[model samples]
Target: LYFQGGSLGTLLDYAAGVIPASQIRAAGAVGAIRYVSDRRPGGAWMLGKPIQLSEARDLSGNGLKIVSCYQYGKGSTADWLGGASAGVQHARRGSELHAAAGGPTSAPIYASIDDNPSYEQYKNQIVPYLRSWESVIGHQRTGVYANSKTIDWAVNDGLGSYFWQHNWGSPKGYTHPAAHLHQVEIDKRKVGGVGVDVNQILKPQFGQWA
Candidate 1:
């Protein structure tokens, strides 16, 4: 299982005291899922603040494998190509940071596709972005975060290597061509006396993280 919280610090808090490592292991949770957003140009954002390579190392040292998703929310159909191109650059930057910090640089970086898009838009925009990401990051290192339809397209079209399917707040009927990671739930929960949105990962896809 992949456990997620608002910040890595919160995850550490849980690992350190709230829940012992043995408990985490007993729960079947193997690692932590974190975010590295390049929504804007200056730097990457995580937990509403700039993210650093040191944070990547922090997760690794704590026995938590790190998985990062990329977000470029400002782009749309009109700028899908640009978004894809930017995703490649952003992923490269992220890889560099992760490597510099002693994290697995080869870990696949998932591109965010939170919105539903038409087939034409997906074919023209999304596919190209993923292909560009693959060109630089290698097909094995490019992944996606989206719904079942998007996952299907990415898999069937040979775009994404791994899929992180989003089905939270909905039934668990969507299926993928291959084994994938499912966002099973997003519940409001407290960690160390602070509210945090917790995401549960089910049947997580492997080979994306070290």
Candidate 2:
């Protein structure tokens, strides 16, 4: 019963709300700290790595083995906790975008030219963690490593699992057309798409009925 989430913000908000309170409270989760990496360099290694490991130790010590979220690179490599957390979001996520927009517009406007952390760097850094997660988390629950061809290569080559999000839809509730449309416009043709993946993911993790 692992629930995969989309993007860092949405997943964090969801876990912050659902876990540790609900009847099926999540045993543990992974959150993004890109700002930490971008704002502070050393902070990436310090807060990102140790905190992730601490969380993994907490969950593992509690007899729970699992993880969920978008990219595992930041926190995964940040604190060296890749082994402690399981990846639950889609890969090559840079290509995914709101349905109405067109395609992953952020790839250029925000992700590429900007000082944003490189996905390749993150991928190489989290290998130890992914293998570790497989060793630990795989032993207990069903692992859902949502992916794209790009993410698949990184993850699949590293002994991790992969889940298909193209059909699962957006795990995040991105419904408003205006919201996504406006974002694309603001991006100056950076983003485009209806984000079909948003809805399809609901069925597996959130238990959304067909």
Candidate 3:
């Protein structure tokens, strides 16, 4: 709130594509939020997940930050829809891949909700899922990537320590004050040869590994 965009830094998150740090950095990004989950079944080359150590090194060594996020499957197999046992299974793998990628234990790993579920769905599903993440990733380091409504649920329900908000199911032109990062410009942008979704860094620290 102290300064408008770029005064602090800019970031981009991408998936189903590849982008090099040098190129995105050259294009004015200070860093990126890359995936730390496994690829979808029958993985495509474009399904970028679990940021490689080589790429992580390339980014960090050049003074760029990297944020870890986990999102595997969607729709029928959404990562956060399967309740408690599903969360445990996914969280374990998410934590493993995150650590394998050199993400610091001190940093939070954002487990994504990625959908706008109803209130009952949130209680019966998302809460249990995120609780599993908290159990595995630690309560202090559990983050959530979701729409504004879900972010609000996480806040009031005390589910996540950090919140990254998306546009879907959100009030038009409104950014939740609790959001550490607000996702914007989903399909309208590309950086470093990959599809990119730009995010506003709402907080001084949005769980980026620096």
Candidate 4:
């Protein structure tokens, strides 16, 4: 089965209880690192590429595998092509960092889209951007992190092969068709003193990027 997962925010916040090398394996949780290129000289949150590379090393040394996630600032919607461009840069950097950290040889670069875009917006803006993105990253290496609609559009359009679906609804909901990972819940619970968004990812072959 795949590991139960959360982002770096959760891992960092709950390090006291969950960061121990043994504890991480026991929990069977993997960590996802969110990054934005222009936000920093390299990665986001003022952690430059060097810092992120180091952090990845620490996480891997502690028995946690890091998956790189990317998103843009406010300009993602207005300049989606630019956002896709940025995503490509971020993905390359992420691959470098992940390898430096001893992570899997190949990892998915998840492009995040938190809000739903109209079909027109997606067809005109997102689709072209993703096409450009695919040219650079290949369909298999690129992952779309968004709701069901975006997931459907991206997959159907051949822009993204991996789907990281987010359907945080009351009573939860079905995992999107062919979704490799789903954000089932948001910040509604605390683990080890850290509030976290929980995700359930497919196990075995589905979760393996290496």
Candidate 5:
């Protein structure tokens, strides 16, 4: 499961309080939970199999935290998403057609669309929902720092208490050797203080961030 594989355990720990389930102390290396956010009214879909929403809920009830991202139109609000919710939208900052920040972090085609204003909205709406997860589950094991134009969507969407992923992949869009190290340094100076984590380079054991 994508949730269990890359950062599943991390998310599991993060959502301990929100979901209130048992522990998978003996988890083994395995497949990830597959999902698709490309479709409208996005919800859970397995990697290679088909399953019902109820089945997904039952499996998640077993202990996994399903942090499913969703979709909304422009200028929407976060008044009644219950508890565990968040998102990334792709509209221009203040277009009449833009969705609000508290929606899912859907990727727009632009390189830097509504990065700041959207983050502001996300801060007000989504962060609370994500933090509610802590109330349900607990703190995560490791921290997650990820980004892209989509990441900008998340940040601008206002989901605070999150790790910002700067680099990795293709043109190495953001993750460069010196750049990653610089981010690590910045992380040490800031995020580390609150016991929040950032990806790092461990000297002899892990090496430098660069």
Candidate 6:
């Protein structure tokens, strides 16, 4: 293969708390998926907002990789519901935060579609939403964090270059072939005493900042 040939170890993502990089290293994980979005108003548990430069330095210093994602709302209040304009706004903020966190200006940031959106929602809202992301983040740099079906639809529509599959509305254990990362477990484990979702890296480069 032309790319890096080996696999990295465990990957995890969290929002309930900010775990120390030392503990993260001790947890035996080589990568962490962190948020670049702002904390929802009054969301006390949303401590993972905008990965800090200090934290990024510590993580990369310890040989751990970092990936960025944007997700501010969920369910009825899902962020992408605002459509194209929302994507423009969110992508700008995400890009800004990602840069502030020491993420490269050219690195990809996963724009999350956290719900099990139906096709109607996908066509009418999601497409425009992701297209806006593409506009702001660039087609090659926009990553989609969504369910398997969404990934398929997005692939067909020529959206996002990077895919991070979530299991919200997907069949059990199904991994999209195009996905660079698959979220295998959520709220089923914790690292550094903080609850997190585990993801599997399926590609050589799963948007790692390292």
State the local distance difference test value for candidate 5: 0.26
Minimal lDDT window, size 10, model 5: 201-210
Candidate 1 lDDT at 29 equals 55
Model 4 misses residue 16 by how many Å?
15
Candidate 5 structure quality by residue, lDDT tens digits, 85-190: 4322211221112123111233111111112233444456545544443333233311123334334444454432233333331134244221111122222221
Model 4 TM-score on a 0 to 1 scale: 0.67
* Residue 186 of model 6, lDDT score: 86
lDDT of 2 by residue, 55-140 (tens): 43343344432222223233324333322342212122312321112212221111111112245644553454444444433422
**Candidates' C-alpha lDDT:** 0.55, 0.26, 0.83, 0.54, 0.26, 0.86
lDDT of 3 by residue, 1-210 (tens): 223344256788888665777788887888889898888875566456778777888889889889899888888889988888888999899888888888889888889888888899999999999998888878888999998889988899888999998887887877777888888778787775677888777889889888
- For all predictions, the C-alpha RMSD in Å is 6.8, 15.6, 2.2, 6.0, 15.7, 3.4
Clash pairs (backbone) in predicted model 3: none
Candidate 6 Cα errors over 4 Å, as ranges: 1-8
lDDT of 1 by residue, 1-210 (tens): 222321212121121122333443444455554444433553232232223466555545557655665664543432245656755676666566445545465677666676667778788778877787787778887778777777877878998787776653222564454534655444444443423333334444443356
Q: Is candidate 1 or 5 superior in TM-score?
A: 1
**Per-prediction TM-score to the true structure, in the order listed:** 0.68, 0.28, 0.93, 0.67, 0.27, 0.93
Number of the candidate with higher lDDT, 2 or 3: 3
TM-score of 1: 0.68
Task: Give a tens-digit lDDT track for model 6, residues 1-210.
Answer: 123233346678998777787788787777799999888876767777768898888788888889999998787778899999898999999999999999997689999999999999999999999999999979988999999999999999999999998988887756778889888778977777789887778898788876
TM-score between candidate 3 and the true structure: 0.93
Error of 4 at 111 (Å): 1.0
Candidate 2 C-alpha error for residue 94, in Å: 26
Cα shift from native, residue 163, model 4 (Å)? 1.0
Off by over 4 Å in 3: 1-7
